[PDB]
Every structure is written in C-alpha cells, then in structure tokens.
Design a protein around this ligand. Structure first.
Ligand SMILES: OC[C@H]1O[C@H](O)[C@H](O)[C@@H](O)[C@@H]1O
Ligand SMILES: OC[C@H]1O[C@H](O)[C@H](O)[C@@H](O)[C@@H]1O
Lengths: 103, 103
C-alpha cells in the first residue's frame, strides 16, 4: 500500500535521474527512452515525479519558447542531482556485497 | 530533503527484504549481517522500517519468549514480501537495459 507506493516512485525517480545524467531532455524524450527500454510510463505517472525531483532541486528546467507550439520544460539533472545519483548507484553496487550474504 | 529521505528508506527497506528472503532473523541478526557487509545501521534507523514493512504485511513476526531475557521479535519475509521483492529485483535488472540508453 504505502510502502509499495513510495518504493515504486523511488525506482521511477532513480530511473529519471539515470536517464537525465548524460543528456538533458523534454519529458517526451524521457517517455520515448523508456519506450525503447520496453517501458510504458504515462504523463500522469511521469509529470508529478519530475515536479517532485525539481522541488527537491535534484532536477531543474528552463522553458523552451516557440511560436509554433506551447512552452516546453527542458530538464537537466542538477549538481545536487548528480551527487545524489552517485550515492544511489554505489548503494546498488553495495547491495551486491549484500546479495552474497543473503544467499 | 523529502525525496532523498524516502529514497534512502527505500534502499534500506529493499536491503532488509533482501536479507530476510532466505533466512528469518532477529533485528540483531540483520544489524550483524549489515556489519559483515561493512554497513552500520543503528536500532533508531532499523526499527521503524521493520515496523513499516510489517504494517504493510511485507514482513511478519512471532515473539520468542524466554525466562533468561525479554521477548524478541523473530521476523520473516511474507508471501506478499517475497512477491514484491521479486518485482523490485527484476526492476533493478531492467534498470541496466536503461543503463545502456543513458550512456
Ligand atoms: O509543459 C510542456 C510539456 O510537454 C512537452 O512535450 C515536454 O515533453 C515536457 O518537458 C513539458 O513538461
Ligand atoms: O524487542 C526485542 C528486539 O531486540 C532483539 O535483540 C531482536 O534483535 C529484535 O528482533 C527485537 O525487535
């Protein structure tokens, strides 16, 4: 219920930070890169997490302004985002020295 | 702040479920197996997560009753815990088909 929900948000949040770490991207680029990974994540799911990560200053954005379409948010992983990402990746790595003790 | 906190709880929660998946254990066994993994996690950190995972029926416990010491909680990963754990491990695995698209 609550634990499952937060942990699943966490996985998706980590995945967003992962995808943004090399290239900045529109939400639509993120959705598309997920599609290539055989993952469907809709706007209803993706948008609030982007907002949550921006609010904690892990992501930041600038508006891309046009005359042809609406303003689009162009997201990048911040300094704080890159450091926290580095922490998490090393923690998954440690979680395989754990996977030795479990088995 | 908030995102960092929930994501770190998530990592530890996953680690607890990982450690409990083969063997049931006292909190002290979990702390000890973490010590062997070069990880220090104190009671103040571990206890509320165990409680949180039990409350979502991912863990369950029975009291070990003695005349020599106090009652001790003996924890195991539930059916629901094992299934959710299986979901998460496969999701980390998928997160390496993601790690190809990131690079
Ligand atoms: O607000 C416009 C939104 O749609 C655009 O297609 C972009 O993918 C996204 O970054 C932005 O949030
Ligand atoms: O309540 C007693 C507590 O301490 C014991 O040492 C056990 O490690 C733990 O499972 C239990 O929660």
């Amino acid at each position: 219920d609550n634990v499952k929900s937060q942990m699943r948000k966490g996985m998706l949040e980590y995945c967003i930070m992962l995808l943004l770490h090399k290239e900045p991207a529109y939400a639509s680029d993120i959705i598309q890169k997920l599609k290539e990974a055989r993952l469907i994540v809709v706007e209803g799911t993706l948008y609030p997490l982007l907002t949550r990560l921006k609010n904690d200053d892990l992501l930041s954005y600038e508006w891309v302004e046009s005359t042809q379409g609406p303003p689009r948010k162009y997201y990048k992983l911040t300094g704080k985002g890159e450091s926290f990402l580095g922490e998490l990746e090393a923690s998954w790595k440690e979680l395989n020295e754990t996977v030795n003790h479990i088995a």
